[model samples]
Structures are given as structure tokens and as C-alpha cells.
Target: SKEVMKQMTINFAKPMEACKQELNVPDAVMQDFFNFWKEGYQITNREAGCVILCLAKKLELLDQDMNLHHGKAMEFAMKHGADEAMAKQLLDIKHSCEKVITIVADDPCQTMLNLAMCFKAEIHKLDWAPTLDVAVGELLADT
Candidate 1:
């Protein structure tokens, strides 16, 4: 299930790629972003936060409160293969991560990174992360 979800996530990045040049994301941070699926590639860079926020905005996944836009996000997930129930569960993870980080930092970049890392940790805990092989297949096949 998460494999398909991973592919869906990858597919979402097609439009997100432009942000690299737009935000002038660091090459090293970009590398970390790519390797992020790896268990050990920690996203400790501040600029990574900027890129994440940039992508989220461009994707229109956040609402007025900068929280997940459930309507559009659900449309995104299901468009990529997630069923209604699974989509709700997916958003639940986002909600939980957002709740844990009580204080939003002044830096939106760092705040975005914190949420992302927390979300990744939750996925890892559930053993739902898409394996590198799935990524490779999606890459080679470009589907």
C-alpha cells in the first residue's frame, strides 16, 4: 500500500522540481532530500526547510492556517491511488505530527522541516516507508 503511496508521492514531485532553482536550494541539501528515504539521511539543514515550504505552497496542499488542506490533499491521494479510508489515515499522520510540534518556530523553513522529519519518523515506525527499490522502479519506469 505504501509502495503505491510512495510512487504517488514521487509523482507529485514533477511540478516540485522547479523549486530547486527558484529557491536556490543547496546541492547538498538537495542530495539529502533525495536520499531522505534512507534511514540515516537526516535533514538537518535549514535551507531544506525552505525548499519543503516552497514545494508545499506550490502544490497548494496547505490552507489559511498553513495546515493540510484536507479536501485537495484527499483529492491528491485518491487521484494517485489511495482509497477514501486510507487517505483519511494518511492525513491523520500529518495531523498527529503537526500536533506534536506545539510551538511553531519563527522560521517557517525550520518549522516545515520539523514537521517533515516527524512525519517521516511516524511512517518509519509503521514500517510503511517506500523502499529504495520502489523508488528505483518508479524512476526507471518514470510512471
Candidate 2:
């Protein structure tokens, strides 16, 4: 939330691509990612959530309780470019957003999508969330 020039060194595309096939997400449901975090667009598709949950699991970012693994997440944040303090706060913000939300979905997959909206909005508020464009760009960089 400061002049840290916060950005990510990694992208979610690999897990995303894998999840699409693993979850059988069609183009329509998957494209929801493009409009993701864009204000006013409500992603009501449950498959999108399932894909996200798959990605989260693939990333090992969640715990046994399905809560964010703050320890690993902090490392991930700093490894991606955040400073120690910013990294801590980055995870903090995510935790706060998760706690602040009122989730109605009984499905864990759907609930994960609900988790994203709140985190994305709050992350956008701090200008820390990554756009899909560069995320894809980095995803292709190593290949």
C-alpha cells in the first residue's frame, strides 16, 4: 500500500492451464478469468471457483483447514518482490479480506472463488494485484 513497486515474479498460468483440463472447464467458464477483478463483473460460474481451488491446491497455498498458509505465503510474497514488511502485510491483507467476507456457497470450490473477489478488491485498493496479461507473459518466459 506504499511506494514499494509491488509486483509478482510468478504467474498462475501453469496451474490455471492444468486446472482447466483437470476440472473440465470450458472456454466460457475459463474466460471469466479475463474479466476477473474488473469492477462490477460478477463471476457467478461455479466451475471458475473450482478451477481456482485447484490452482490454490496446486500452489500449496492453503492449509489443512483450507486457510491460507501465511508462512509460505509470506515467503512467496517476498520472493515475488515484496519487501519483508510488505510481504507480511500482503498476507495480512489477504487474511483480513477472507475474514471480512460473507460466503454463502456450501461448496469449497465455489467458496474459493468468493475468497478471490474480496481479496482482489482489497488488493486492487492497494494496487498490488497482478493483471492476467503479464501473468501470462511471465508464465511463457521460462518456456
Candidate 3:
């Protein structure tokens, strides 16, 4: 399937490695999904992942009208963490994540599992992004 192909290419590429490094996770962490989270945040922090958005998605942190929590996270990032350029990037990422949330809402099990993998790839490319999935695994699994 195209989705599986996309998963292999995007989730198993050098960019993904970079993303994981950004998150600070090792490769083994991603081989299994639930096992990663079984560990707590202390070890995961060494290889952190982005969970705020994912948790929001899993918790159905959308509007009563059905909109995702994209706006809130973007607003927060822009207001608290981002500047002009980073703000734009954060917004774009938030939008992209919203799309992912929509696609995965019905099957949160797979959605979150894959998102954790894919996001690691993307984050590693940022100036703040790392270069390993282990870090991504660690962070995504963490609370």
C-alpha cells in the first residue's frame, strides 16, 4: 500500500535518523511501540520526543466543533517558544500534525504508533532537531 511505502521511506530514512537524534532516542527504542513508553521520562529525556501534540491527539483534544488542537499548539509555540521564523515552522508542523491526527483518529493505535516514528524523522532535521530515532523513541514513549 502507498501508506506502508510512505512509512518505509519516510520513517526509515536518514532524515528519520536525524529526527531521532534531535529527539535524542536510540534506534532500538522504535522497534516496538508500547515497550518504549513502558519506560519513564527520566531515561526518555536523554532522547526526548514531542508528546504534547500526540497526547492532545490521543486525548481527542479537538474543538467541540471537530477541529484539532493545531491552533492551540501553534499559538503556544509562537507565543512561548518560537520567534518569527520558528513560529512559522511551528505552525506548519502543527498543521501537518493535524492532518495526521485526522487520518489516524479512527485508528489511534496505528496513528500514534506511526506518528511517533515519523515525527522523529522530521524533528531531527530542525536546527534543534537531533539525528537518531532512539531519542525520538525515548521522547515519544515518555509522558
Model 1, 34-122: lDDT tens per residue?
A: 66656657668777767656654454422333222323555455544556775565567666767786435578776666766776676
**Alpha-carbon shift of residue 46 in model 3 (angstroms):** 23
TM-score of each: 0.63, 0.63, 0.35
User: Model 3: residues >4 Å from true position, as ranges?
Assistant: 1-54, 57-70, 94-106, 129-143
Residue 78 local lDDT, model 1: 50
> Which digits, one per residue and each the tens of the lDDT, describe model 3 over residues 37-131?
43332223212223222333242322223222323433434334345565455435534654564344455444544444444445546676322
Q: Which window of 10 residues has the lowest lDDT sum in candidate 1?
A: 134-143
All-Cα superposition RMSD per candidate: 10.1, 10.8, 16.4
User: Candidate 2 has what TM-score?
Assistant: 0.63
Candidate 3 has an lDDT of 0.39
Stretches of candidate 1 above 4 Å error?
A: 1-17, 60-71, 127-143
